[PDB]
């Protein structure tokens, strides 16, 4: 089953390259409790904007490029991702563009930060129809001192 | 001596009432490797928002209410911070805003990081005159896969 992984501003906006303008530790608590464990799959900008194999999680880099680092497989395209996962039952795809737009009609499940904050960007989230999905949870939360900004949290069912 | 250490914002905001929007790991590498081994000064407000002790450096917090934890020093006036410091060459002031104040004119040194964000903000770090600093040392930096926002740091000291 492929899952989806994504924090998304106002409009939908994700990162291109450079890092999102909020801090939200509280959404990287939520991205290590659902990915941990589990194989991901990431597109470049993704990588280095992470800048280390992601503990506890099998990572494979969906690129045209090549291979830099041996800790990490390194993958060119849609099915060998699929294959490098193995017979698992969840594969998460944690972005960027590109990557989410390739998996995304394959995909049955949708982890959402749907966050506060207006940022201006090229780059969106896939269109998806919240018609042909069902939200199994939704969860709100208030900016903090350790959180920038408000965000909800959204799981999505494709129905 | 006495030093500063601060990250602002323009128009000189140092705090919003929850997390700074900006996503900063440059900025929290030249911070540890400017306070390391040294004693830090802080207030109450500032001390929550980190969290836990700062490690391997002395915590100092700066409070007229009474402390919360047995791993950091608690004090009560800015004479009483000093004398816990000891006799060490220079003493690190984090902040927020009031701690600045209050220090500033005992302070020798300055270690700024100026971020490209506006925002609005709470607190601000106190005018200082800039006929009366000289820069010794400047670096520019832009916005990269791991750091939100262009910044530059500056360390001024006291003509
Ligand atoms: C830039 N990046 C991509 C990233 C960031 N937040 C997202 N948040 C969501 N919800 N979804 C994504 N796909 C997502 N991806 C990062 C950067 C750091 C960490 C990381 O350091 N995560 C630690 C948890 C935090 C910490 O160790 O400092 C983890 O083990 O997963 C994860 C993703
Ligand atoms: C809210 N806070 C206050 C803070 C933040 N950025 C600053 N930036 C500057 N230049 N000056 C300050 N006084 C400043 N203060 C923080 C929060 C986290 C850390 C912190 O975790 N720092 C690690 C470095 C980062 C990593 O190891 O997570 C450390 O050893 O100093 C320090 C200060
Ligand atoms: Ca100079
Ligand atoms: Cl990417
Ligand atoms: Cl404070």
Redo the contacts between chains.
């Keep these: 089953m492929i899952s989806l992984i994504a924090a998304l501003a106002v409009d939908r906006v994700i990162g291109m390259?450079?890092?999102?303008?909020?801090?939200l530790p509280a959404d990287l608590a939520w991205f290590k409790r659902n990915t941990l464990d589990k194989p991901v799959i990431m597109g470049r900008?993704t990588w280095?904007?992470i800048?280390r194999p992601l503990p506890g999680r099998k990572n494979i880099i969906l690129s045209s490029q090549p291979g830099t680092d041996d800790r990490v497989t390194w993958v060119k395209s849609v099915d060998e991702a699929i294959a490098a996962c193995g017979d698992v039952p969840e594969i998460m795809v944690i972005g960027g563009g590109r990557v989410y737009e390739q998996f995304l009609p394959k995909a049955q499940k949708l982890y959402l930060t749907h966050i506060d904050?207006e940022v201006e960007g090229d780059t969106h989230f896939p269109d998806y129809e919240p018609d042909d999905w069902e939200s199994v949870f939704s969860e709100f939360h208030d900016?903090?001192?350790?959180?920038?900004?408000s965000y909800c949290f959204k799981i999505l069912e494709r129905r």
């Design positions: 390259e450079n890092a999102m303008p909020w801090n900008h280095e904007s800048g904050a900016a903090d001192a350790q959180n920038s900004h």
